[PDB]
Amino acid sequence: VRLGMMRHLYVVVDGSRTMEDQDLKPNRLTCTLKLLEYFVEEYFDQNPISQIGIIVTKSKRAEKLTELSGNPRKHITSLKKAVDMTCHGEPSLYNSLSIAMQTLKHMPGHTSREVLIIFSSLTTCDPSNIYDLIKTLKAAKIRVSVIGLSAEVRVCTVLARETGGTYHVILDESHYKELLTHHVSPPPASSSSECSLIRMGFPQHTIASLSDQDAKPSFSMAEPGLTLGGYFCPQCRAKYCELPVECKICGLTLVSAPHLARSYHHLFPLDAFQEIPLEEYNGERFCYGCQGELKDQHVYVCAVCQNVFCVDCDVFVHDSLHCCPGCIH
Amino acid sequence: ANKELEEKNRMLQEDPVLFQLYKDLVVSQVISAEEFWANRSDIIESIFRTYPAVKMKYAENVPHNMTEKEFWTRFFQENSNAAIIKRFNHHSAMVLAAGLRKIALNLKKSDRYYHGPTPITSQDIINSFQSIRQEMEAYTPKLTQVLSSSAASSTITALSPGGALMQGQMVPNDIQSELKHLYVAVGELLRHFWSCFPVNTPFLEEKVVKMKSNLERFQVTKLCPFQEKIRRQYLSTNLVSHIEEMLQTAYNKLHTWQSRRLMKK
Amino acid sequence: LNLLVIVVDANPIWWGKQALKESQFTLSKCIDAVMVLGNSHLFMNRSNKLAVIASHIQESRFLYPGSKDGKYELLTSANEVIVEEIKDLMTKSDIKGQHTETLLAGSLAKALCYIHRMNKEVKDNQEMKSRILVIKAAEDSALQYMNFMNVIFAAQKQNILIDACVLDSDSGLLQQACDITGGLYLKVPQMPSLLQYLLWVFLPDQDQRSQLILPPPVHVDYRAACFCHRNLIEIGYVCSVCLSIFCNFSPICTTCETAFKIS
Amino acid sequence: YMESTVASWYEQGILENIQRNKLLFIETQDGAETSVALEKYQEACENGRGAILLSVARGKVSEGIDFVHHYGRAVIMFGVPYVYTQSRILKARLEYLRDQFQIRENDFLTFDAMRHAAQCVGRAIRGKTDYGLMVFADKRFARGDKRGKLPRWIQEHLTDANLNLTVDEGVQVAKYFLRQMAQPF
Amino acid sequence: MKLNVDGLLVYFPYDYIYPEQFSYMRELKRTLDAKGHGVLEMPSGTGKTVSLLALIMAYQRAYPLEVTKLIYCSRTVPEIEKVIEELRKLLNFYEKQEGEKLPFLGLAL
Ligand SMILES: [Zn+2]
Ligand SMILES: [Zn+2]
Ligand SMILES: [Zn+2]
Ligand SMILES: [Zn+2]
Ligand SMILES: [Zn+2]
């Protein structure tokens, strides 16, 4: 199944009054922001080439809290600042989606444009009908996958299914974590989706040539002090503090080899290991994965290496490591 | 309409950096400023959009020998019973009308990932295997064999700052702001100069603007070295050469692509 | 507390080459130095715990899950178990000429999941700061890059420090690996003096590493190359499916077979 | 009664808050206004504004209209539907039934109320297994006779635990039930 | 979907039927076999029409002399339009199953 490795995602947060209601254990808005910080960090950790943008909608107006960027810390700071937001007004799906569409219209065709609307207040007061905007969204192939809160909104249901996204409603906080963690992963590319080669640039960390001879002093490029060494660009030739980042001049993505390598496991998903409770002639008391005695009647095995893994080993392998230790051999 | 003049007045003092750089491009009289922009309550409003009757009444009763407080007062002011229901029906209808304006993947070569971009007889294995098998028939020699004082002292001397494996200035402050400002100017103009440079753009109207921008490169880099000269003749310390690399590399790209265009022709 | 894991690269081909050369350094002394390091690590504190793995071309095996000489019972048990198991593993081994490169990614994966198991079992009251003191001894294999990168990223997410201690060779992949997770990278040139390096550079834990002078990190060359002839490239043309660094613009990348549309 | 309740809510601030939360539409005897209001109500339901359609149980709109998925999601019944006890036609119709066929006047009156309520509350389950909740804001329905005369399919789903929920408890359980129905099969 | 009803075999266009549909069909067949007027209630606004129409058509095929024709009445014309749509779908399904046209006529006044 074709997957879009590079995706520009907009997490549309609503500053509606209904967010005031403390349906969850803490305030709803505070919980959403606290978990969305984790979502942002994990999304960047699972898709370095991708970038994210936050639009906060309240009082019938949508404001770009943070433009598209490759730095998780800046977005995290924006979330922490927004934690104290007043949270009064009414959202406008038309306004939020129009802002997202305006920013995403000029984005490259190859990248997957995606929107995740964390809908809280079921109402949607908009200057213009949103069914018309749905046509433009379908034309622009911008995937929109709403996540409703305490409501199965019909307009958002049709939005999601027509635009190709998925609709969900929060059963509880634990299920909210699961929903956002699921949305972290790249979505499969459908027929409407198209792939195209994208120019990429690989910089190399550089320092003073020899005892600060013919040095290359520079401060930064988006109170930066002088830097003896740092990253550079093949074309900008402008010092960059951290990678990966889009060029401020070229418009070309600067990214190192490990960042790309971080996404190969998506192309190579791990086949689920059959769960057999009984020992099944497994005379090895120690679990091969962790070399620990199997204290539970559960075993996992591959179709190639035919090794033995306990519950923790299998869960960790399929969750984070994304590869079978013994089966690597 | 003087929309450009209105926008310039709006951004004249609201945003300092934008106007600072736009003015800087003219301070030394580099180029014309045309290309700069060429290339790049609630209740009353709600009533205004809600009640067309109120809109007509406002148009006809625009303040004339009256007061806005009086106009506000005029707002709130079975026959009455049905009027309320009719009024809600009409008002909700008006609000709604105002809101209603008129692929499975397959691959042939997977080992390329197994050996990614990272770069790079028979009896020898047998000999090594047997020798290492016979190596460790004796164990636990830690008492003296593992380490010796002379080697330990050599290791400590190496770990010393002058030793092996251990190799071992913010004096200017005001110059920092000037360097930052110059870098911002370079970035601003390089943005437009590189906006369409990577793309071939084999069209007459597309190439005209790259030619104009290429000339603008000469014209801006004409004035950059004069400020460089002013800064240089202070102490001849802490050389600023990174700025030179950007200009020289832009010139190299310009000339190389000009030669390539001539070759293509 | 701290959970240390020593991933020793005991490659029979290379260590037996040393044995044939009759050099001063030997695998026996390397194992003794690693043993002393582990003993000192546990010596540091009771709560501290350690484990050992041996890396071989075929597979990797754990070397670790009275006072006859007046010795501490726990460290005596550690000495006996590691000595016996390492001798058994080295003595018994099949021969396969096709596969001779040392295996390290699988050993590191085993270490990572072992650390996860210990972190799950340990009480939540005490926080565990695990570490992996990888000790390479032979050149790495090109085909292992992908899996090794997977395990390195897993370690980064799980907050484990990969302290590399390569000797006799500088593995660019391993230095890249430890750089990502912030682990130290020391290249000891004096093998008979390896243990002094451990008791200074590696032995101190992450808690005290910041407040201590240690050798500066080595510059890491994050090179990129096209999949054709294997050479450094500064500009890569990747697609949206393969995510592969290529040579030059082509109508369709071979590893994709996609119907790229020109423009 | 609908007009009196609407007027009281208008005098108080409840009605304005309801208007803010969601659009409000009302029914009138005139068929033209009824049709226009319902036409706008459908568009409101399609859009995210939503709508609250106040109507009368005996109104021709109630019988003619059919509510489906994302239409009339939550059916609210304000008061047991009873015809005025002054219309003399029903007096003949009712006392004659008492005299012949032996039906108690109260029995037939409660039957006429329960049948009408079931008619006007049974629309949300039209078809295609579209979720929806029917809330009856009247303690009279909690009486055994009303429950017994209620249709079997609704009554069996109804339970004693939720029989006489307070307003707040009913709101909470409605929210939870909507959560459960939101997720797919 | 051919259902082996107790009385006979009855065709059905949709894939699956709930147990309440089985109960409805069996009770309706009992009433028709008794050839006596009766009353019954089914919750669903839709689905009852298709089940009733299918059972009546199958009973007509089995005992054409027993029932001359079906007179199905609905409250309003907009509603009876949906009924005629359901009947058209059922007839198309049955015609596809049989492979040919049969002397069956259905209309709305
Ligand atoms: Zn650049
Ligand atoms: Zn295990
Ligand atoms: Zn396996
Ligand atoms: Zn090439
Ligand atoms: Zn490809």
Swiss-Prot record, chain A:
Domain VWFA: 8-184
This protein's record includes keyword Zinc: yes
Location of this chain's protein in the cell: Nucleus
Origin species: Homo sapiens
Sites bearing Phosphotyrosine, chain numbering: 43
Any one Gene Ontology BP term: G protein-coupled receptor internalization
GO MF annotation terms: RNA polymerase II general transcription initiation factor activity; zinc ion binding
UniProt similarity note: Belongs to the GTF2H2 family.
Annotated keywords: DNA damage, DNA repair, Host-virus interaction, Metal-binding, Nucleus, Phosphoprotein, Transcription, Transcription regulation, Zinc, Zinc-finger
Residues of the full protein shown: 53 to 387 of 395
The protein, known as: General transcription factor IIH subunit 2
Quaternary context: Component of the TFIID-containing RNA polymerase II pre-initiation complex that is composed of TBP and at least GTF2A1, GTF2A2, GTF2E1, GTF2E2, GTF2F1, GTF2H2, GTF2H3, GTF2H4, GTF2H5, GTF2B, TCEA1, ERCC2 and ERCC3. Component of the 7-subunit TFIIH core complex composed of XPB/ERCC3, XPD/ERCC2, GTF2H1, GTF2H2, GTF2H3, GTF2H4 and GTF2H5, which is active in NER. The core complex associates with the 3-subunit CDK-activating kinase (CAK) module composed of CCNH/cyclin H, CDK7 and MNAT1 to form the 10-subunit holoenzyme (holo-TFIIH) active in transcription. (Microbial infection) Interacts with varicella-zoster virus IE63 protein.
Annotated phenotype, changing residue 233 to A: Reconstituted TFIIH complex lacks p62 and has no transcriptional activity
UniProt lineage: Eukaryota, Metazoa, Chordata, Craniata, Vertebrata
GO cellular component, one term: nuclear speck
Entry keyword Ligase: no
Effect of residue 322 to A: No effect on the transcriptional activity of the reconstituted TFIIH complex
Zinc fingers, C4-type class: 233-250
Curated annotation (Swiss-Prot), chain B:
BSD domain mapped to chain residues: 1-40, 41-77
Signal sequence region: none
Location(s), subcellular: Nucleus
Highest taxon listed in the record's lineage: Eukaryota
PTM (free text): (Microbial infection) Upon Rift valley fever virus infection, interacts with NSs leading to ubiquitination by the NSs-FBXO3 E3 ligase and proteasome-dependent degradation.
Chain coiled-coil ranges: none
Reported function: Component of the general transcription and DNA repair factor IIH (TFIIH) core complex, which is involved in general and transcription-coupled nucleotide excision repair (NER) of damaged DNA and, when complexed to CAK, in RNA transcription by RNA polymerase II. In NER, TFIIH acts by opening DNA around the lesion to allow the excision of the damaged oligonucleotide and its replacement by a new DNA fragment. In transcription, TFIIH has an essential role in transcription initiation.
Quaternary assembly: Component of the 7-subunit TFIIH core complex composed of XPB/ERCC3, XPD/ERCC2, GTF2H1, GTF2H2, GTF2H3, GTF2H4 and GTF2H5, which is active in NER. The core complex associates with the 3-subunit CDK-activating kinase (CAK) module composed of CCNH/cyclin H, CDK7 and MNAT1 to form the 10-subunit holoenzyme (holo-TFIIH) active in transcription. Interacts with PUF60.
Family designation: Belongs to the TFB1 family.
The protein's name in its UniProt record: General transcription factor IIH subunit 1
Organism: Homo sapiens (Human)
Record gene name: GTF2H1
From Swiss-Prot, chain C:
GO CC aspect terms: core TFIIH complex portion of holo TFIIH complex; nucleoplasm; nucleus; transcription factor TFIID complex; transcription factor TFIIH core complex; transcription factor TFIIH holo complex; transcription preinitiation complex
Zinc finger (C4-type): 239-256
Keywords: DNA damage, DNA repair, Metal-binding, Nucleus, Transcription, Transcription regulation, Zinc, Zinc-finger
A UniProt-annotated Pfam family: Tfb4
Molecular function as annotated in GO: RNA polymerase II general transcription initiation factor activity; zinc ion binding
GO BP, sorted A to Z: DNA repair; nucleotide-excision repair; regulation of DNA-templated transcription; transcription by RNA polymerase II
Location relative to the cell: Nucleus
Family listed: Belongs to the TFB4 family.
Oligomeric and partner information: Part of a TFIID-containing RNA polymerase II pre-initiation complex that is composed of TBP and at least GTF2A1, GTF2A2, GTF2E1, GTF2E2, GTF2F1, GTF2H2, GTF2H3, GTF2H4, GTF2H5, GTF2B, TCEA1, ERCC2, ERCC3, TAF1, TAF2, TAF3, TAF4, TAF5, TAF6, TAF7, TAF8, TAF9, TAF10, TAF11, TAF12 and TAF13. Component of the 7-subunit TFIIH core complex composed of XPB/ERCC3, XPD/ERCC2, GTF2H1, GTF2H2, GTF2H3, GTF2H4 and GTF2H5, which is active in NER.
Protein name: General transcription factor IIH subunit 3
Organism of derivation: Homo sapiens
Curated annotation (Swiss-Prot), chain E:
Effect listed in the UniProt record for changing residue 48 to R: Decreased transcriptional activity of the reconstituted TFIIH complex. Damaged DNA opening by TFIIH is impeded. Loss of TFIIH 5'-3' helicase activity, still binds GTF2H2
PTM comment text: ISGylated.
Lineage: superkingdom: Eukaryota
Residue positions binding ATP: 42-49
Subcellular location: Nucleus; Cytoplasm, Cytoskeleton, Spindle
This protein's domain notes: Interacts with GTF2H2/p44 via the C-terminus of this protein; mutations in the C-terminal region of XPD do not alter its helicase activity, but prevent its interaction with and helicase stimulation by GTF2H2/p44.
Subunit structure: Component of the 7-subunit TFIIH core complex composed of XPB/ERCC3, XPD/ERCC2, GTF2H1, GTF2H2, GTF2H3, GTF2H4 and GTF2H5, which is active in NER. The core complex associates with the 3-subunit CDK-activating kinase (CAK) module composed of CCNH/cyclin H, CDK7 and MNAT1 to form the 10-subunit holoenzyme (holo-TFIIH) active in transcription. Interacts with GTF2H2 (p44) which stimulates the 5'-3' helicase activity of this subunit. Component of the MMXD complex, which includes CIAO1, ERCC2, CIAO2B, MMS19 and SLC25A5. Interacts with CIAO1 and CIAO2B; the interaction WITH CIAO2B is direct. (Microbial infection) Interacts with Epstein-Barr virus EBNA2.
Family: Belongs to the helicase family. RAD3/XPD subfamily.
Descriptive protein name: General transcription and DNA repair factor IIH helicase subunit XPD
Source organism per UniProt: Homo sapiens (Human)
